[model samples]
Target: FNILLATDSYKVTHYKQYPPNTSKVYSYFECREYEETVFYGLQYILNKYLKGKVVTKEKIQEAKDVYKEHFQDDVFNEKGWNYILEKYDGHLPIEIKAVPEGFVIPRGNVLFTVENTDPECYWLTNWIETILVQSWYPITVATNSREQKKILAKYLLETSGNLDGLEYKLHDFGYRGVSSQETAGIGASAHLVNFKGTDTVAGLALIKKYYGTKDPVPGYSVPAAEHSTITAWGKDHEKDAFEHIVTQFSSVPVSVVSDSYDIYNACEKIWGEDLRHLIVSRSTQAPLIIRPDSGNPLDTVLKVLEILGKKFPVTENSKGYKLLPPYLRVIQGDGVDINTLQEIVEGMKQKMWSIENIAFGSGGGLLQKLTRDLLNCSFKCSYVVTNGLGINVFKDPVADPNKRSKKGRLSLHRTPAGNFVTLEEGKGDLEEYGQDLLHTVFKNGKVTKSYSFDEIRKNAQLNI
Candidate 1:
């Protein structure tokens, strides 16, 4: 072919319209037909990526080079790049906005919108995966965490009388499970939107910057040890490792990976017999948290409870459930996905054990086990400017009417029943589903507003 578009089909005639210009296009970003329990993660994307970023000459030059590198034979769309450089100045010329982060999206509601402030920049919003799905990482992770919370919340309510200790229930352990450093922070921060606990330090920074916190951090972590720390003491010195943890973190709650050698032995013999006194003698304030990192979590945690119950005297909560001494608790750090977490809680309920008997930390399962379908998030064009006259644009494939996109500029509103709803631009209903669901989040290469970490967090929490 003599003609080719740069990085993303900017000038490919068959790919898009023959020549890009005054043809304005508007699109909706939605999580259509999701199986997830809740929808979250719009604010992080708007705040981080789209807001306040200006494209520069250097960036356009880089784009030119990239366009040439891939399409050698065909003519590259240097004109489009030049237009981007001249008009938007490397800054996106599109106006973007979304449903506030952490809002519940259950399939078919437009989570956000992307339309040209400069009507000529219509290709900015593509229905393809890379356009918006690449932006799906944070949303998927946030949805995963929120869905996990919903599962845990149900089980917790069913098993426990109320939702105390729920904030720290599921901790994020997927930092290394992600692809990049930024991914680690983004995924972890999204996870934190649903819970107040995290081990990913990058997430903590996100909480500070995006959530607006200094002294009172949005997320917290405990002093914890990994296998490398315990195993480093020599395989024979397992008892020494436990003893050191007891003495070192005696004044404060600390988590230790106990399954370096024998998980049961660590709970039954070492942490139970050898280190119990040191753990207790230190103070009632600090608990020696035990984490079994490997094995079937259901079986292993139950066994840990059995062993700890035998060695540690148990008390009852107001709900008449068993509780370990305040100085000790078991945290299942391995194989903890939403299903396993629910199974753990269900298993506890079945056994008439308190859901408080154990807590969990998950790595790949929690942070990395999400797919695009996790929330069914989608972004597509619904309206366009044809010859300077606005027209409702829609795609209704006979194969799947469900894949049919909306048709007009969109706005988010809530139904009288408190469910999220999307309205076509100028379709009316502004009196009902007004801007409460969809606000002006971005405009003119700048963010129109900001939300505190606790504020976004509030939207995720209490989602009963």
Candidate 2:
């Protein structure tokens, strides 16, 4: 369950492969699946290089005796772990530097690098490429997600009537549709940098890993809402569909799918005046959110808002109306992405709805469904490894000025006006710019800096 600890332990074993005089060292710790192989190779490197210097035949025999004593068999049976032990006899040492998880790094930048301490382990670095590239994918996506969220926030604040009111309620809903668990958690964290909350509980786990509190504690009180779905066909069977969801989760601030069956008609038919009266009369006690999941979300949202704006006019319903009621928000769930969301906001700018009047729950487009290229944001071979040494570090190929990355390590510099800039390693004029982007999170087979979910969440908010 302690993922950091487990991963560190595996990494420590993998790094012990190169011996002092060994001619080559390469990276092999690229994928989680290959940790064992890396470890076994490390063991081999250790034995080969340390054979006469520090480890004699007698010492080797002693280590073998200990291994035999621990396991009835001479070799450890765990494939990955034993693969590492079998190869180099656990002798190499390596130094690895990685950008902190959740840091917003740009393309063409080296997030982290590993080098062999022993000459023999130099070749191991090459084997590490595949796994390193794989690891970088999530980080790249998460970083991009944060930027997207920021852009969304900017758009919402500019268009919404009250920016202050809606600042803390943005929630990320891309988890269920993401390709993998790692992506889900990392993406959620990235979104947290710009958005206020996330629906993914696994992201909470990461938050727990990096932050300390949970349940919207002070300085982290971003409330999130859920939006469910129903197709047009299901709308025909309104009673079964409505009752089914209501019964499944009773009394929660539920956002029901009403747009499936003529969104306007469905709202009028199912909830009708009675439900409207309930929302108007009771208001504060129980709020209900209605989602228009199908059709042109822009038009449907406008229409839905037009109906709600009139039917439950705030001026007339003074006594019970709780500042527009908790359940009064409409979410545009289908095909809502950057462009569509932009259009909806533009429409709202022209009419009755405010950005606060609507919430967004994007699926496919935000979750790599729009374009495969967005999902493929990854760290590739920006530099070539020829023969045995690193060479030709390249910059990004794009012409976009903002898309280019600062080479080498990075430091973030914050101006007095509150704007921030990413600076090259150790060259920023600001004192904070000198701070290293990475921390030795794990060391010597142990997690040196373990954080709780609340701590992680808090760090995310503060840094942002």
Candidate 3:
């Protein structure tokens, strides 16, 4: 569907109920999921969807016809497209103040506001609600990924003296594991705010197509073997399968599933005894990553480490953690949710294992687990114009105190103290607002400003 094209069609057909003659409206968006460290994704919405956009008679008519046909049976009461058909021009007068894509969302503050500047377009104000709501996916994913980066960076700094490998620490193995190809692209791109590695091919394709970055890809995966690739050689040919993985592949670090037959035997009888020397004797710096993708993540990871540590040459970091030699590492991809990741990291820390000795891969937890609810995302009207007079509008929900909403035409400012405060419509002097953080990103079906991927990544710098 031409959602953007049909902005007029998507909004309520019964908008005449805005008390008639309401011309100019002010609405604000907030993440009521108040516990999140920060909100993300406005840059993406502005740059990809709203930037430099213009409507057409053909596009608008197509959308109107669609609504007419689609809503004929449903409760959709699109009285007519005449509401917007005769407007000055088929465009949206949208102005917004958003925390830059990568920056923190002021802890707890409005992410952005959407309103129609044209009096005739008041009904068109909330048309972007559908697009705006999808922001939860990318922002929530970005926030979760950023927090994970801090966790990994903490352990990496302690073990490796710097966070050099932080980019590749958490791999996105969530392409086929998500709801759709589109979400795979969105969720994976969001993950890129913190890390550079991923197995989500759709995500890589998305950034290339939309964000204009092909010289560098968004996510990556190495040539690795699955359980089928290993089992294809038959039960008696397990050692032979391991040989091709370590020998046939290029000089790149590749992950191999070792639990096909028996994880212990694969590590000891095959890799530890026979294949260990082959791996140890390879004339390259590439490491063979052994993955145990079943059972409890913490116990399986610790068990695999215990088995591999004894057979491989081990060195010690200044933090008193045992570092695996450059030829080997372990990746525990099973049961690795956020909580499990923390426990595994802490377990390795207590066991004196260097963070360099392992890495991680996530699928559903990284991409599918989060929704708008995670951030308590919400959008509501704060101010509106009725009969040429502006008024504050709010919803005070008695049943839920947290559901109470904000009122007034709002402007957000950054104080000299580097924190945010909301500027109200009637009470505050418009001339006194200082260091206004919002820029004209989108207006009149056009995108005024857009962000490059690199600039956005820099903006998302971890506070820790």
| Candidate 3: segments with Cα more than 4 A from true spot | 4-10, 33-39, 43-89, 212-215, 282-285, 426-433
lDDT of 3: 0.75
Q: In lDDT terms, how accurate is model 2?
A: 0.46
Q: What digit string (tens of lDDT, one per residue) describes model 2 on residues 164-185?
A: 5443444456777888886676
Per-residue lDDT, model 2, residue 452, is: 44
- How far in Å is the alpha carbon of 266 misplaced in model 3? 1.2
Clashing pairs in 1: 33-107, 55-90, 55-91, 211-453, 409-425
- Per-candidate TM equals 0.90, 0.61, 0.91
Top candidate (TM-score): 3
Candidate 3 weakest lDDT stretch, 10 residues = 74-83
Error of 2 at 457 (Å): 4.2
lDDT of 1 at 282: 49
RMSD (Cα, Å) of candidate 1?
Answer: 3.6
